[PDB]
Amino acid sequence: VSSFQDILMRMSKMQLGSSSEDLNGIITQFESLKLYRDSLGEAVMRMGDLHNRNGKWREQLGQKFEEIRWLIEEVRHRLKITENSFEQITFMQALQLLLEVEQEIRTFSFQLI
C-alpha cells in the first residue's frame, strides 16, 4: 500500500535530529533487500521456461534468508520501543513491505536452485 521510496523518506526524516546509528543500518538494509528481491524475480524471468551450483550458489541465496529475517526483527524491535505515532506507522509500513520481500525471496530462490 505504501510506496517504497515513501517509506524510505519517512525513515530518512526520522534520521535527522536523532542519535540512532542503528537507523542507517536498518535503512541501508531495507533498501538493499528490497532491490535484491527485484533482481531475484528478474533472474527467474531470464530463465524463461525454467531453462545452479549446489552448495556455493545455494548458500549465496540461503544467506539472504537470514538477512531478511533479522531485518524484520530489527524493525519490530524499534517498533516495540517507540512511542511516537508517526514513527510507529512508518515502522509498520516497513514491516508490511518487508514481509512481502521475505515471501518473494524464498519463492524466487526456490525457483533459482
Binding site: 535484491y36 533482481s39 533472474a43 531470464r46 549465496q60 533459482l112
Partner: peptide
C-alpha cells in the same frame, strides 16, 4: 553473464 552473480561478487 548473470547479473545476479555479478551483484553477489
Amino acid at each position: 553473464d548473470s547479473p545476479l552473480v555479478r551483484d553477489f561478487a
